[PDB]
Design a protein around this ligand. Structure first.
Ligand SMILES: Nc1ncnc2c1ncn2[C@@H]1O[C@H](COP(=O)(O)OP(=O)(O)OP(=O)(O)O)[C@@H](O)[C@H]1O
Ligand SMILES: Nc1ncnc2c1ncn2[C@@H]1O[C@H](COP(=O)(O)OP(=O)(O)OP(=O)(O)O)[C@@H](O)[C@H]1O
Ligand SMILES: Nc1ncnc2c1ncn2[C@@H]1O[C@H](COP(=O)(O)OP(=O)(O)OP(=O)(O)O)[C@@H](O)[C@H]1O
Ligand SMILES: Nc1ncnc2c1ncn2[C@@H]1O[C@H](COP(=O)(O)OP(=O)(O)O)[C@@H](O)[C@H]1O
Ligand SMILES: Nc1ncnc2c1ncn2[C@@H]1O[C@H](COP(=O)(O)OP(=O)(O)O)[C@@H](O)[C@H]1O
Ligand SMILES: [Mg+2]
Ligand SMILES: [Mg+2]
Ligand SMILES: [Mg+2]
Lengths: 347, 298, 209, 292, 202, 356
C-alpha cells in the first residue's frame, strides 16, 4: 500500500537526469541532457547513500525534483578491460630479451612475493616502468609474458577507452580503475599508448583540448595523491618517447626507463617455430632456407607468411601446405619494405 | 528488440505502437537497386586482379566450408590503390553487376554532417543495415578524406573526424567479429591516410593497379574501337606501341580525338594517321626533349 | 501536402535573367579555341546524331588556362549568350565556409540541382584555390579544402556518372593542382590560351575599331 | 552594435546603456597611480621641458594655438639606452596631469591566431576616441617594428598587419585629433619608414647617457628617503659609477642600504657604495692563465 | 505587388499569422557600416599642390562616367574601371582620395584592407562579396582601398596555410572586380606603398 | 531491475506523508547562471545562461545586494528570471587541506653547503616577526615578498621547509596548478578567501609554489577564449597592496623559469629582495650523499667525495636518483649492503646515458 503511493507520488514520464554536485540540505544541483543546470530539490526516500557526482537520477517535468537514483550497469567501463582469463605462454614464447626480464621481475614480483630485501636495507620499490623503442618491437608480447607469471590480478587498458566527450568521464574512470586496483589484489596498471593523451602540455581556447589536459593532470594527480595506494604497480608503454610528457620522465614519479632494442636472426627461429606450430606443416617443407635468405622480418611478417602459406593451400583444394607455398609466400609477402642498405662497402 | 523504434505520445510520453522497418535514415546513397550499368568483358588486360577480388568476395560467401575446414578465418579488409586509377570504378561495377547480391555504396565525405555527434551517430546505424541483410558488400570511396593522421587537440587539428574515424576501426573489430560483410577501400596515394587500420589485423588484401602493358593497351583499344567505325588497313598494335607506359584512361582520349577529327571532315571513315595525331596530342609531358637532359647521363 | 521537388537550396543563377550581353563574334583573334569549346559544349547540344553514329561521346568537361588577359570569361559569356541549355555560374571560393561539413555538402547541393534541371552547363571560375595537390595536412584548414576536392572528385565520375552535364573550368596556372583532375575522362580538353601573336593583332585591332 | 534591452515577448527596445568592450582592452585601462615629481629625474631636464612643451599645453591651453593658426602634433617618441627615462617619465606625466592613462604593450598585440592585433589595436583606439581626455601610451614598439622588406616566414602576417593597421590609425582617411599618442622604443634602426615622420610622430626625443653629475644627481634622490650620513662625497660617487643608468644606480642605492642593515649601522659611507657597486656585476675571475 | 517578390529578396513575416508584411532591401552587415559614415576633410582641392598633372588625370578617369556618359557614347569605348596610386610615402595617397570624397560624394567606402581577415577561414571572402553588393546596390559609388600590399603577394607554391587563405582571399577579389558580373557605375581607387610584389593578374 | 532508491521503509515513512508535498508547490525550481557585471546605486545585473541568451534582471526581495559580485552563481526564477538565492561556487574545500599546521620531519641540517641563502631567508622571515625594532630604529621599510628562482631540484622546497619548522605557526603551501580551475572566476574568489582567513591569526607564512601556472607567466597571450590566468593574476596583485603595512603575514614565491618576471611586481611594495639558488661547489653535493645513504644499509668503508667528483653538473634530485639506482644493484644479487661498485655503475648509468 505504502509502496504504491510513493511510486505514484512522482510523475510518470520520468526524465533521465545527471548529477553534478551535492549539497547536504535537501536540495542539489543537477544537469539536464541539454546541459541546462537546474537548482532543484531532492526527496527523502531517494536513499541518500549512493549519490555520487557523475551518476544519473530521475527528474520531474514540473519542478524537476530528484525522484530517484538510476543504475547504469554499475560500471560498464572498468569490468570489460579487466583480464579474467589466462594470457599466452609464460616465458618460452619470447626469446633473446632476457636482459630486461630481471628488471621487470625484481620491480614487480620482488616487492610482492619477497618484500624483505626492501626491509633489510630500507629501499622503496619503484612505481612507474616505461617501455619504449621501435614500433612493434615486442612490447605487447612482453607485457603478456610478465602478466602470465603472477599471483595478483592484472589490468589491460587499450588507451582509446579513456577519452569520451561527456566532460567528466575522463577523470571518472581514473578513480574507477584505481578502485578496482584497490579493492582487488595490488594489480598492475597497464595503460598502453599514452602518447595520444600526454604530449607537449599545450592549452588552447576551444572546447576540444580541455577534456584532455585535465584528464592528463587528474591522472598525474590520482597516481601521486600520496595518501594510501597499497603498492600499485604501473606499466606504461608507447613506441616513441621524444614527443611525450617531460614531467613524467623526471624522477619522483617514474625511475624505470626500459628500452627494447632490435633483435637478430637468433630470436627468429623460435618465432618461426611458434608461428608454424598450429598448422598442418607437411613433412616436405623447409624453413631453414627461409631464415637464412631474408635478413629483416618481424613476428608480424612471419604470421603474414603463415597466413599466405595457409591461403595457397586452400586455393588448389588441399589440406597440408607444401614447400613451394612457403617459398612463394616468402617471395610475395616479404617484398614490401626491402629498401635501403649499404651493401658491398663495409668490412 | 535491438534498434527498435516505437510510436511515442508527445504529452504523456507513453507507448503507442512498435514501429517496423529498423533504423536506417539516409539510405538514398545506399541500396542502388539497379544492376545493369556495365557488363563483364569491357575491362580487359587486368585479369589477375579480377580473380583476386572474385575469390575474396564470392568464394568466402558461396563456399564458406572451404575456409571453415582449415582453421583460419576469412579476410574482410580489401584495399585498392592506383595512382592514376587504372580501373577502380569500372572494376567495382562489374563486380556489382555479376554478383547477384545486395550492394552498398558509401561516398567519403557524408559523415561530417553539420555539428558534433551526428556524423558519429550514423556510423552504428549504417552497419546494422548491412548486418540486417547478410548478403551485402559495403564500398568506400576516397578514404583519403575520411582519416589522415591523429594530430593533437583543437589547436592545429580537426579533432572531430577523429571521433568518427575511431568508430570505424571499432565498429568492425573490437566488439564482435562480424561475418558475411566485406568492405572495399578504394583510394590512391598511401601516405596521407593512417597506417593503424593498414595492419594485417584489419586489412588482409592490398591489391595494387599497375599501368597497362602492350597487350593490355591493345585489348582496351579493341573495346573502345568496337562501337566505332573503322576503315581497313589499320594497325591497332602500333597505337599501343606508341604509348610509352600509358594509363588506360587515355585510351578513351585517343578514341575521342580520332572520332572528332573524322567529325570535322563529315566522314565516317578513319585512318591510322588520325590515331597518330590523336596520341601525339595527348602525349604532352614536361620531359624537356633537348637531347641534353636525358643525354648527359647515359 | 507534398511540395514539388527543389523547394530548396541555393540560387537559380539566371537562365534568362541578367544574362551577359556579348555576341559570339565579338571575340577578336580566337579561332581554334573559339571553335574547340563550341565543338565540345554547344555542338553536342545541337547535333546529337553525328556523335552516336560515329561513337565519339563528347567530353565531360574542359580545362582552360594561360596568362591573364587572353579572354577566359569573355569567351565563356559568348557561350552563355548562345547556349539554350542551363548555365550554372559558380564562384570557386563560394564554398570556403566556417561551418564544418557544409563545404562538401554545397558541391553535393549544386550537382543535384544540375541533375533535376536541363542538360546543364556548370562553370566554376577559380580552381587553383581548391585543387592543389595533397600532403600531410597538419593544420585544420588544410583538411578543410582537401576533402572538398574529393567530394568534387566523387561526383564527377562515380557509379551514377551524371550524364549530359558539362563542367567548364578556367584557371590561371594549371600545374599547381591535382594530377587526378588532369587525367582524361573528366577534362579531355587541355586548351591553352596563349598570348596573341602577329596575324591576330590585326584581328583584335579590327574588332575594337 | 548596441546592447539594447529588448522585451522577451513584444520585442521593444526598452533601455540601452551598453558600455561593453573586450576583456583585454578593459584590462589595459590603468589609472589612479601615486604621484611623482619631475624633480625625481635629474640630468634629463631638457627632454622633460621638451615634453612640457609638447603635450600639456595642447591639453591645457587650446586657445594658445588657435590664435596662431598652428596645429599641435600628437606623436612623441622616447628612445635611447634602456632603463633611463622612457616609461618612468610618462608615468610621472600621467601621475600629476590626470588624462586617463592607457598603456599598450608590444608582444600582447602578437597573438596566436591570425587577425587578432588588427582587432585589438582598433578596439584600443575606439575606446580612446570615446574617452575625450584620454591619451595613448605605447611601449616596446620595436617588438612589432619591422622594416616591411624581408618577406621571411612567418613574420610577414603576425607583425606586418598589426603594424599596418596601427599605421592606418595614426592619420587615416578621417582625422583623429581627440587623443594623443606616446611611443617608447629602444631601436630606431628597425622601424618602418611609415612608423616615423609627422602625422604619426616626428618628435624624436633622444635620450643621452646620464653623465657623472647626472649619476650623482640620481643617487641623491633615491637616498633621500633613507638615513644617510652627511659625510658623503658626490665627487667620489660620480667618479666610481661608470656606464650606469638610473636603474642600476637605484640598485646600488638599495644594496648600500641593506649592507648597513646587516651590521645595524644607521648611516652610509662611500665604502657602502663601493661594496654596492661591485655587488651588481657579481665580481668574478682574477686571471685566465693566458696573459702572464 | 508580388512581382517585386524576387526569389532571394528579404521580407518580414508576421509573428502569428506568419504571412508577409513588408519586404526589406538587403542587410548591410555593420562591419562595413563604419566604412561609410565618416567625413574626409571638407577640402576643396586647395590643400594640395604640385600634383595638378596627376590630379586632373585622375579626375578625368573617375568624374566623367559618374557625370558625363555622353562623351563615352559618342566614341566607341567602354567606360573605364578604377586606377592605382603608387609611390613613396608622404606625397598624397590619402589626402588625394580625401579630396575626391569631398567633391560629389554620392556613396563612398574606405577599406583599410587589414580588418578583413580574422581567425575564421571562410570569413574573408564572405566579407568582400557582401561589401561589393552594398556598393553595387547603391549604384554611383566610389571605392577606396588603402594598402593593397597587405593582401597582395605573388601567388606562389606551398605556403603554410595561414598564407593560403590570403591567396584564396585575393582570388575572390579578382573575380568580383573583373569577372562574370558586369560591374557598372562602381569605380575603385587602389592605393599602395610598394608596387612590386602584386599579382600580374591583378 | 528498476531500483530507483528503494530505501527499506524505516527512514522515509514519516518523510513521505506530506513533506514531499511541501517540497512540490512551495519549493520552486531555480537555475544557476553567471554574472557578467553590475551597476552602481541600481542593480541592473547582466546575466547569461550561455545556452539560451543574456538577461538583464534583478535580485528578488529575499537577499541583500552585498554579496552579489561579478562571476557568481545565482538562483534564477523560472519565469520572472529574478535572482532568489545566490550560489557560492562550491566553497571551501581547498583551505583546510592547505593550512595543516603540522610538524614536518625535516632536520635543519638537511640543507647544508648553501649557507649564504639560509641567512638571507633568516633575515626576511624570522627577524621582522620577532625583532622588528631594528627596521623601526633606522628608516627602511620592512621587506615583504621575496621571489625565488633558479635551477629545478636545487632545494627550493627544503629552503621553504627550513623556515617552516623554525616557527611552527600557520604554514600554507599553495600549489600553483591547484588554482588552475575549469570555472571562469573560480580561483580569484579563493585568493580573496585565503588572504582574509590568514589575517585572522598572526605570524602566518604562505608559500607560492610553481607560479609558472598562475603567477604572472605569459600574462594573456595564449588564452584568447578562457581568461582565467589573467583574472586571478589581476586580482592577487590588487589585494596584495592597498593594505598590510609593517608585516603580519609573509608571502613567498618560487619559479623555475626566470622569464615570468613582472616589473609591476618589482615595484617596491610587492617584491623587493632577490634570492636565487645555485649549485653546490663540492661539499654541498657531498652533504647530499651522506644524508641519502644513512637511510639505507651501506658500507661503512666507502667515501662520497669521489662520487661528487664524477658529478660535474647535478642536482640533489639527480643525486637521489643515483642512490635509488645504486641500491637496486645490491638487490640484483643477494647483497644486504651497498658496496662501492654499485655506486660506480649507477653514476655511469645515470650521467653517461643522456646528460653529457
Ligand atoms: N582496364 C580498363 N578497362 C576499361 N577502361 C579503363 C581501364 N583502365 C582505365 N579505364 C578508363 O579510365 C577511366 C578511369 O577509370 P576509373 O573510374 O576506374 O578510375 P578512377 O578511380 O576514377 O581514377 P582516379 O583514381 O584517378 O580517380 C575510366 O573512364 C575508364 O573507362
Ligand atoms: N581577343 C579578345 N577580343 C576582345 N576582347 C578581348 C580579347 N582579349 C581580351 N579582351 C578584353 O580584355 C578583358 C580581359 O579579358 P577577361 O575578362 O576574359 O580575362 P580572363 O581571360 O577571364 O582572365 P584574367 O582576368 O586572368 O585575364 C576583357 O574584358 C576583354 O574585353
Ligand atoms: N602633395 C601634398 N600637398 C599638400 N599637402 C601634403 C602633400 N602631401 C602630404 N601633405 C600633408 O601630409 C598630410 C597627409 O599625409 P599623407 O596623406 O600625404 O600621408 P601618406 O602619403 O598617405 O602616408 P602613407 O603613404 O605612409 O600612407 C596632410 O596634413 C598634408 O598637409
Ligand atoms: N634620472 C632618473 N631619475 C630617477 N629614476 C631613474 C632615472 N633614470 C632611471 N631611473 C630608474 O630606472 C627605472 C627604469 O626606467 P624606465 O622608464 O623603466 O626605462 P625603460 O622603460 O627604458 O626600462 C625607473 O623605474 C627609474 O626608477
Ligand atoms: N642541502 C641538501 N641536502 C640534502 N638534499 C638536498 C639538499 N639540497 C637539495 N637537496 C635535494 O634536492 C631535492 C629538491 O627537490 P625539489 O623540492 O623538487 O626542488 P625544486 O623545488 O627546486 O624543484 C630534494 O629532494 C633534496 O633531496
Ligand atoms: Mg575513381
Ligand atoms: Mg579572368
Ligand atoms: Mg596613407
Amino acid at each position: 500500500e505504502e509502496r504504491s503511493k510513493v511510486d505514484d507520488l512522482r510523475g510518470t514520464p520520468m526524465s533521465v537526469g545527471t548529477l553534478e554536485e551535492i549539497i547536504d540540505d535537501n536540495h542539489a544541483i543537477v544537469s539536464t541532457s541539454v546541459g541546462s543546470e537546474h537548482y532543484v530539490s531532492i526527496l527523502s526516500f531517494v536513499d541518500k547513500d549512493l549519490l555520487e557526482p557523475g551518476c544519473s537520477v530521475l527528474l520531474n517535468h514540473k519542478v524537476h525534483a530528484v525522484i530517484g537514483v538510476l543504475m547504469d550497469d554499475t560500471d560498464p567501463l572498468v569490468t570489460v578491460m579487466k583480464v579474467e582469463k589466462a594470457p599466452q605462454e609464460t616465458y618460452a614464447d619470447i626469446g633473446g630479451l632476457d636482459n630486461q626480464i630481471q628488471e621487470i621481475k625484481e620491480s614487480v614480483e620482488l616487492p610482492l612475493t619477497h618484500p624483505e630485501y626492501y626491509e633489510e636495507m630500507g629501499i622503496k620499490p619503484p612505481k612507474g616502468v616505461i617501455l619504449y623503442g621501435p614500433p612493434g618491437t615486442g612490447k605487447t608480447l612482453l607485457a603478456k609474458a610478465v602478466a602470465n607469471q603472477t599471483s595478483a590480478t592484472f589490468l589491460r587498458v587499450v588507451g582509446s577507452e579513456l577519452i569520451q566527450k561527456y566532460l567528466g568521464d575522463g577523470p571518472k574512470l581514473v578513480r574507477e580503475l584505481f578502485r578496482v586496483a584497490e579493492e582487488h589484489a595490488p594489480s598492475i596498471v597497464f595503460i598502453d599508448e599514452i602518447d595520444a593523451i600526454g604530449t607537449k602540455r599545450y592549452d588552447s581556447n576551444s572546447g576540444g583540448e580541455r577534456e584532455i589536459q585535465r584528464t592528463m593532470l587528474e591522472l598525474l594527480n590520482q597516481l601521486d595523491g600520496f595518501d594510501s595506494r597499497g603498492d600499485v604497480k604501473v606499466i606504461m608503454a608507447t613506441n616513441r618517447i621524444e614527443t611525450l610528457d617531460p614531467a613524467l620522465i623526471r624522477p619522483g614519479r617514474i625511475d624505470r626507463k626500459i628500452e627494447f632494442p632490435l633483435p637478430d636472426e637468433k630470436t627468429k627461429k623460435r618465432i618461426f617455430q611458434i608461428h608454424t606450430s598450429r598448422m598442418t606443416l607437411a613433412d616436405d617443407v623447409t624453413l631453414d632456407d627461409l631464415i637464412m635468405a631474408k635478413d629483416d622480418l618481424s613476428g608480424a611478417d612471419i604470421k603474414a607468411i603463415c597466413t599466405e602459406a595457409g591461403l595457397m593451400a586452400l586455393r588448389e583444394r588441399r589440406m597440408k601446405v607444401t614447400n613451394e607455398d612457403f617459398k612463394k609466400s616468402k617471395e610475395n609477402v616479404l617484398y614490401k619494405k626491402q629498401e635501403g642498405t649499404p651493401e658491398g662497402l663495409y668490412l | 528488440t535491438p534498434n527498435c523504434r516505437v510510436a511515442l505520445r508527445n504529452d504523456s510520453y507513453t507507448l503507442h505502437k512498435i514501429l517496423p522497418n529498423k533504423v536506417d535514415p539516409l539510405v538514398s546513397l545506399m541500396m542502388v537497386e539497379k544492376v545493369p550499368d556495365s557488363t563483364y568483358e569491357m575491362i580487359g588486360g587486368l585479369d589477375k586482379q579480377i580473380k583476386e577480388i572474385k575469390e575474396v568476395i564470392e568464394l568466402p560467401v558461396k563456399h564458406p566450408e572451404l575456409f571453415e575446414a582449415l582453421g583460419i578465418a576469412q579476410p574482410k579488409g580489401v584495399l585498392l590503390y592506383g595512382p592514376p586509377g587504372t580501373g577502380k570504378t569500372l572494376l567495382a561495377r562489374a563486380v556489382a553487376h555479376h554478383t547477384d547480391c545486395t550492394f552498398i555504396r558509401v561516398s567519403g565525405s557524408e559523415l561530417v554532417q553539420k555539428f558534433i555527434g551526428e556524423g558519429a551517430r550514423m556510423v552504428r546505424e549504417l552497419f546494422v543495415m548491412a548486418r540486417e541483410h547478410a548478403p551485402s558488400i559495403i564500398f568506400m570511396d576516397e578514404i583519403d578524406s575520411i582519416g589522415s593522421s591523429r594530430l593533437e587537440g583543437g589547436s592545429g587539428g580537426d579533432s572531430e573526424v577523429q571521433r568518427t574515424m575511431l568508430e570505424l576501426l571499432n565498429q568492425l573489430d573490437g566488439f564482435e567479429a562480424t561475418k558475411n560483410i566485406k568492405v572495399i577501400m578504394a583510394t590512391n596515394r598511401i601516405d596521407i591516410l593512417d597506417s593503424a587500420l593498414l595492419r594485417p589485423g584489419r586489412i588482409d588484401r592490398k591489391i595494387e593497379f599497375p599501368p597497362p602493358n602492350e597487350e593490355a593497351r591493345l585489348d582496351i583499344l579493341k573495346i573502345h574501337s568496337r562501337k566505332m567505325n573503322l576503315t581497313r588497313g589499320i594497325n591497332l598494335r602500333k597505337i599501343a606501341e606508341l604509348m610509352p607506359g600509358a594509363s588506360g584512361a587515355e585510351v578513351k582520349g585517343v578514341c575521342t580525338e580520332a572520332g572528332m577529327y573524322a567529325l570535322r571532315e563529315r566522314r565516317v571513315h578513319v585512318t591510322q594517321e588520325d590515331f597518330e595525331m590523336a596520341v601525339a596530342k595527348v602525349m604532352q609531358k614536361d620531359s624537356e626533349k633537348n637531347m641534353s637532359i636525358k643525354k648527359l647521363w647515359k | 501536402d507534398v511540395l514539388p521537388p527543389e523547394a530548396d537550396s541555393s540560387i537559380m543563377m539566371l537562365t534568362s535573367d541578367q544574362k551577359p550581353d556579348v555576341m559570339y563574334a565579338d571575340i577578336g583573334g580566337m579561332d581554334i579555341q573559339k571553335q574547340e569549346v563550341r565543338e565540345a559544349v554547344e555542338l553536342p547540344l545541337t547535333h546529337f546524331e553525328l556523335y552516336k553514329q560515329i561513337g565519339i561521346d563528347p567530353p565531360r568537361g574542359v580545362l582552360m588556362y594561360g596568362p591573364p588577359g587572353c579572354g577566359k570569361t569573355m569567351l565563356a559569356k559568348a557561350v552563355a549568350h548562345h547556349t539554350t541549355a542551363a548555365f550554372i555560374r559558380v564562384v570557386g571560393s563560394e564554398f570556403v565556409q566556417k561551418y564544418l561539413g557544409e563545404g562538401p555538402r554545397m558541391v553535393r547541393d549544386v550537382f543535384r540541382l544540375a541533375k533535376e534541371n536541363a542538360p546543364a552547363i556548370i562553370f566554376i571560375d577559380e580552381i587553383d584555390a581548391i585543387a592543389t595537390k595533397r600532403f600531410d595536412a597538419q593544420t585544420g584548414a588544410d583538411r578543410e579544402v582537401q576533402r572538398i576536392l574529393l567530394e568534387l572528385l566523387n561526383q564527377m565520375d562515380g557509379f551514377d556518372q551524371n550524364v549530359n552535364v558539362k563542367v567548364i573550368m578556367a584557371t590561371n596556372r594549371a600545374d599547381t593542382l591535382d594530377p587526378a583532375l588532369l587525367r582524361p575522362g573528366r577534362l579531355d580538353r587541355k586548351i591553352e590560351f596563349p598570348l596573341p601573336d602577329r596575324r591576330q593583332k590585326r584581328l583584335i585591332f579590327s574588332t575594337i575599331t | 552594435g548596441d546592447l539594447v534591452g529588448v522585451n522577451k515577448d513584444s520585442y521593444l527596445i526598452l533601455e540601452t546603456l551598453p558600455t561593453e568592450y573586450d576583456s583585454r582592452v578593459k584590462a589595459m585601462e590603468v589609472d589612479e597611480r601615486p604621484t611623482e615629481q619631475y624633480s625625481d629625474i635629474g640630468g634629463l631636464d631638457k627632454q622633460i621641458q621638451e615634453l612640457v612643451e609638447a603635450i600639456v599645453l595642447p591639453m591645457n591651453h587650446k586657445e594658445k594655438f588657435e590664435n596662431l593658426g598652428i596645429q599641435p602634433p600628437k606623436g612623441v617618441l622616447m628612445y635611447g639606452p634602456p632603463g633611463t627615462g622612457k616609461t618612468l617619465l610618462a608615468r610621472a606625466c600621467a601621475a600629476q596631469t590626470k588624462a586617463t592613462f592607457l598603456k599598450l604593450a608590444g608582444p600582447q598585440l602578437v597573438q596566436m591566431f591570425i587577425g587578432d592585433g588588427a582587432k585589438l589595436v582598433r578596439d584600443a583606439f575606439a575606446l580612446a576616441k570615446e574617452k575625450a581626455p584620454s591619451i595613448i601610451f605605447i611601449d616596446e614598439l620595436d617588438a612589432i617594428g619591422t622594416k616591411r622588406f624581408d618577406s621571411e616566414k612567418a613574420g610577414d602576417r603576425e607583425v606586418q598587419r598589426t603594424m599596418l593597421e596601427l599605421l592606418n590609425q595614426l592619420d587615416g582617411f578621417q582625422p583623429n585629433t581627440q587623443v594623443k599618442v606616446i611611443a617608447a622604443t629602444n631601436r630606431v634602426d628597425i622601424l618602418d619608414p611609415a612608423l616615423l615622420r609627422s602625422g604619426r610622430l616626428d618628435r624624436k626625443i633622444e635620450f643621452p647617457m646620464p653623465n657623472e653629475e647626472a649619476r650623482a644627481r640620481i643617487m641623491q634622490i633615491h637616498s633621500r628617503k633613507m638615513n644617510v650620513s652627511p659625510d658623503v662625497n658626490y665627487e667620489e660617487l660620480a667618479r666610481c659609477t661608470d656606464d650606469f643608468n638610473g636603474a642600476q644606480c637605484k640598485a646600488v642605492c638599495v644594496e648600500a642600504g641593506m649592507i648597513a642593515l646587516r651590521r645595524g649601522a644607521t648611516e652610509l659611507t662611500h665604502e657602502d657604495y663601493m661594496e654596492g657597486i661591485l655587488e651588481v656585476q657579481a665580481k668574478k675571475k682574477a686571471n685566465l692563465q693566458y696573459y702572464a | 505587388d508580388k512581382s517585386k517578390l524576387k526569389p532571394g529578396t528579404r521580407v518580414a513575416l508576421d509573428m502569428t499569422t506568419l504571412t508577409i508584411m513588408r519586404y526589406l532591401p538587403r542587410e548591410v552587415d555593420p562591419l562595413v557600416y563604419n566604412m561609410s559614415h565618416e567625413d574626409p576633410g571638407n577640402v576643396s582641392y586647395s590643400e594640395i599642390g604640385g600634383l595638378s598633372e596627376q590630379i586632373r588625370e585622375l579626375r578625368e578617369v573617375i568624374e566623367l562616367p559618374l557625370t558625363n556618359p555622353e562623351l563615352f557614347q559618342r566614341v566607341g569605348i567602354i567606360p573605364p574601371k578604377g586606377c592605382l596610386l603608387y609611390g613613396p610615402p608622404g606625397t598624397g595617397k590619402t589626402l588625394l582620395a580625401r579630396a575626391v570624397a569631398s567633391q560629389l560624394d554620392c556613396n563612398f567606402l574606405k577599406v583599410v584592407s587589414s580588418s578583413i581577415v580574422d581567425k575564421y577561414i571562410g570569413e574573408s571572402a564572405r566579407l568582400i562579396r557582401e561589401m561589393f553588393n552594398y556598393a553595387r546596390d547603391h549604384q554611383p559609388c566610389i571605392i577606396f582601398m588603402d594598402e593593397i600590399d597587405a593582401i597582395g603577394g605573388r601567388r606562389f607554391s606551398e605556403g603554410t596555410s595561414a598564407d593560403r587563405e590570403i591567396q584564396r582571399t585575393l582570388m575572390e577579389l579578382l573575380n568580383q572586380m573583373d569577372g562574370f558580373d558586369t560591374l557598372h557605375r562602381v569605380k575603385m581607387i587602389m592605393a599602395t606603398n610598394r608596387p612590386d610584389t602584386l599579382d600580374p593578374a591583378l | 531491475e528498476s531500483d530507483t532508491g528503494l530505501a527499506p521503509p524505516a527512514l522515509w515513512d514519516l518523510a513521505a506523508d506530506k513533506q514531499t508535498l511541501q517540497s512540490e508547490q512551495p519549493l520552486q525550481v531555480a537555475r544557476c547562471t553567471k554574472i557578467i557585471n553590475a551597476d552602481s546605486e541600481d542593480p541592473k545585473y547582466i546575466i547569461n545562461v550561455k545556452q539560451f541568451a543574456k538577461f538583464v534582471v534583478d535580485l528578488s526581495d529575499q537577499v541583500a545586494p552585498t554579496d552579489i559580485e561579478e562571476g557568481m552563481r545565482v538562483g534564477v526564477d523560472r519565469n520572472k528570471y529574478q535572482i532568489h538565492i545566490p550560489l557560492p561556487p562550491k566553497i571551501d574545500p581547498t583551505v583546510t587541506m592547505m593550512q595543516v599546521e603540522e610538524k614536518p620531519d625535516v632536520t635543519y641540517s638537511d640543507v647544508g653547503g648553501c649557507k649564504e641563502q639560509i641567512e638571507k631567508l633568516r633575515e626576511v622571515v624570522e627577524t621582522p616577526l620577532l625583532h622588528p625594532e631594528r627596521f623601526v630604529n633606522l628608516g627602511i621599510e620592512p621587506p615583504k615578498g621575496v621571489l625565488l628562482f633558479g635551477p629545478p631540484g636545487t632545494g627550493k622546497t627544503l629552503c621553504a621547509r627550513a623556515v617552516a619548522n623554525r616557527t611552527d605557526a600557520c604554514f600554507i603551501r599553495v600549489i600553483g596548478s591547484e588554482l588552475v580551475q575549469k570555472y571562469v572566476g573560480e580561483g580569484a574568489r579563493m585568493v580573496r578567501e585565503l588572504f582574509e582567513m590568514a589575517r585572522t591569526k598572526k605570524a602566518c607564512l604562505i608559500f607560492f609554489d610553481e607560479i609558472d601556472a598562475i603567477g604572472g607567466a605569459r600574462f594573456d597571450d595564449g588564452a584568447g577564449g578562457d581568461n582565467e590566468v589573467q583574472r586571478t593574476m589581476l586580482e592577487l596583485i590588487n589585494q596584495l597592496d592597498g593594505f598590510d603595512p609593517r608585516g603580519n603575514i609573509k608571502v613567498l614565491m618560487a619559479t623555475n623559469r626566470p622569464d615570468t618576471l613582472d616589473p609591476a611586481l618589482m615595484r617596491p611594495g610587492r617584491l623587493d629582495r632577490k634570492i636565487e639558488f645555485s649549485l653546490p661547489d663540492l661539499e654541498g653535493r657531498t652533504h647530499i650523499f651522506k644524508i641519502h645513504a644513512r637511510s639505507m644499509s651501506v658500507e661503512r668503508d666507502i667515501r662520497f667525495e669521489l662520487l661528487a667528483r664524477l658529478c660535474p653538473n647535478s642536482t640533489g634530485a639527480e643525486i637521489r636518483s643515483v642512490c635509488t639506482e645504486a641500491g637496486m644493484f645490491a638487490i640484483r644479487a643477494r647483497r644486504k649492503i651497498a658496496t662501492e661498485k654499485d655506486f660506480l655503475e649507477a653514476v655511469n648509468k645515470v650521467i653517461k646515458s643522456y646528460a653529457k
